[PDB]
Symmetry: D2
Subunit: 120 residues, 4 copies
């Protein structure tokens, strides 16, 4: 109900997710940036029984950057929390790992942050 | 074939994963450490068509720290790569996000690294 | 000139820095949050000869969370870049490491992000 | 005494540091890898009064990747802890930020880990 929907980050990327009663996140990610084109499968987990003390719902998900059209040979993971209310928000940090040789493996992982809203 | 199996990190945690032809990672994670007990659902993605130039296979997965017995109100995501061969290895970095209030949200996310092997 | 001044993050923390011609950052950090009180020494480095193609100036600094009044047994490092202009900005990611036992060393390092402005 | 000396990471990079009574880290970093050549200035902070319960000494430092010969337009920060004894160790996580345009700023920051020893 809270986590299920279409979400928009600060850089124009669309996250369409369903939050299953089991704790399963399933969906699609459409990336407005990077070496990516069009629509990619999303899987993840959330806290299906969160704390009743104004605390956020912990969640996470993975996109492997491969569809029928593109393969970037990379995967992003987002770790974050859902803050429910009027201005509903998913505050995340992410790791983008690229498939490298063992000589290039030191420089394989980019780190960043995304804030997602239900407002396009 | 390569990614499918039972994997062991440096701190004694067991990762039992199946790598589907679609790019789906499904499994269980058993955590030897932290505010955790017993067995937790794992979902993730991998690069199902990796590069043929000695480069690793990009992957990632999520565990929400909630089963039938425990709820830590937290989720870990691992971002990494599979290096195939005799000494087969998953080199990862991870983000552990805890469900917090907006006052505690600065301190919500632990970062670290895990190396997983097929040797117990 | 650009980097030298008083800077304010999103959570009300004050960063007073001098950018030396050698590439040295020296200053004080006053933390509005965490297990901290009052004023702490800052040292760091910046790119003293940045690129002339609209690119930001790479920098970084360290605060050990120990003064004459408090010791949190911890250190934060910020890694980022200075974007110069009318709305002058330091966009950073940070690592906060706490002094732990080898049993607690997995959970020693918090990760986050700060944006600093010259507007209080 | 403990932190003062010559340190060697897993990838052959040399860290020569002095730990001042004030909490100041001063030195040189010689990087065996990346778009770097030869010797670079290091500044940082450590916990000058650590806990007496077998806990590590929190520290951190910055290298801006600019000397008289090279400028990579980038800075690394290491956040970590000193574990003293027979097999003396600095366990770190690091952030490498590159000077980018605001279009490339999502991909500006690499994350990783280094373990440093006093054995070449
Ligand atoms: O460039 C690549 O290697 C593949 C595309 C990566 C897209 C990145 S992942 C972090 C950030 N979140 C997004 O909305 N997309 C970018
Ligand atoms: O303590 C918690 O909040 C829940 C358990 C967390 C387990 C952590 S996640 C990173 C690391 N990988 C493991 O094998 N388990 C620990
Ligand atoms: O709580 C502690 O262990 C010591 C204080 C930490 C202050 C943190 S560091 C990251 C962030 N930046 C700030 O302005 N202060 C907080
Ligand atoms: O390639 C660059 O942009 C400059 C050189 C970076 C060297 C990296 S920083 C992290 C790691 N630690 C080292 O010993 N050097 C590499």
């Amino acid at each position: 109900a809270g986590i299920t929907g279409t979400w928009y980050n600060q850089l124009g990327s669309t996250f369409i997710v369903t939050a299953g009663a089991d704790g399963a996140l399933t969906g699609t990610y459409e990336s407005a940036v990077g070496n990516a084109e069009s629509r990619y499968v999303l899987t993840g987990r959330y806290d299906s029984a969160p704390a009743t003390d104004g605390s956020g719902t912990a969640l996470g998900w993975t996109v492997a950057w491969k569809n029928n059209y593109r393969n970037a040979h990379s995967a992003t993971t987002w770790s974050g929390q859902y803050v429910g209310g009027a201005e509903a928000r998913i505050n995340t940090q992410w790791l983008l790992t690229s498939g490298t040789t063992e000589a290039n493996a030191w420089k394989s992982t980019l780190v960043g942050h995304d804030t997602f809203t239900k407002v396009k």
